[PDB]
Amino acid sequence: LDDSWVTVFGFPQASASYILLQFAQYGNILKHVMSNTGNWMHIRYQSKLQARKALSKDGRIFGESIMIGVKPCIDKSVME
Amino acid sequence: DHLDDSWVTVFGFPQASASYILLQFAQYGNILKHVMSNTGNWMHIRYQSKLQARKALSKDGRIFGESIMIGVKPCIDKSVMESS
User: Sign of torsion, CA B74 B78 B79 B82?
Assistant: positive
State how far the alpha carbon of A79 is from the alpha carbons of A4, A12, A72, in Å.
10, 23, 11
- Partner residues linked to B36 by β-bridges: B43
Kind plus residue range of the DSSP H or E element containing A6: strand A5-9
Q: Which residues of B touch A (CB under 8 A)?
A: 9, 11-14, 39-42, 60-61, 63, 66-71, 73
Q: Does B24 fall in a domain? A: yes
Contact check, Cβ <8 Å, B67/A39: yes
Q: Does B39 fall in a domain? A: yes
C-alpha closest to that of B21 among B1, B37, B2, B4? B37
Closest-approach residue (CA) in chain A for B66? A38
Q: What CATH number did the domain enclosing A62 receive?
A: 3.30.70.330
Q: Does B70 fall in a domain? A: yes
SS3 A30: strand
Contact check, Cβ <8 Å, B69/A38: yes
Q: Does B44 fall in a domain? A: yes
User: A23-31: which pairs have CB atoms within 8 A and are 24 or more residues apart?
Assistant: A23/A54, A23/A57, A26/A50, A26/A53, A26/A54, A26/A57, A27/A51, A27/A53, A27/A54, A30/A4
Pairwise CA distance, residues B74 & B57, whole Å: 8
Q: Which residues of B touch A58 (CB under 8 A)?
A: 71, 73
Q: Does B84 fall in a domain? A: no
Q: Write down the experimental method used for this entry.
A: X-ray
Pairwise CA distance, residues A27 & A45, whole Å: 6
Pairwise CA distance, residues A29 & A50, whole Å: 9
Residue span of the structural domain in which B18 resides: 1-75
Q: Does B37 fall in a domain? A: yes
Amino acid letter, B21: I
Pairwise CA distance, residues A42 & B49, whole Å: 34
Q: Does B49 fall in a domain? A: yes
Tell me, what DSSP letter sits at residue B30?
A: -
Q: Does A80 fall in a domain? A: no
State how far the alpha carbon of B68 is from the alpha carbons of A10, A69, B50, in Å.
8, 12, 25
Pairwise CA distance, residues A68 & A30, whole Å: 21
Kind plus residue range of the DSSP H or E element containing A42: strand A40-45
Backbone φ and ψ for B8, nearest 5 degrees, come out as -135, 160
Q: Which residues of B touch A9 (CB under 8 A)?
A: 12, 61, 69, 71
Answer yes or no: are the C-beta atoms of A41 and A57 closer than 8 Å.
no
Answer yes or no: are the C-beta atoms of A24 and A14 closer than 8 Å.
no
Contact check, Cβ <8 Å, B69/A39: yes
Contact check, Cβ <8 Å, A7/B61: yes
Query: Residue A58's CB: how many other CB atoms inside 10 A?
Result: 19
State how far the alpha carbon of A7 is from the alpha carbons of A48, A64, A75, B35, in Å.
14, 21, 9, 27
Q: In what order do the strands lie in the sheet with B31-36?
A: B31-36, B42-47, B7-11, B71-74
Resolution of the structure in the document, Å: 2.5
Q: Which residues of A touch B (CB under 8 A)?
A: 7, 9-12, 37-40, 58-59, 61, 64-69, 71
Answer yes or no: are the C-beta atoms of A79 and A40 closer than 8 Å.
no
Q: How many domains does chain A have?
A: 1
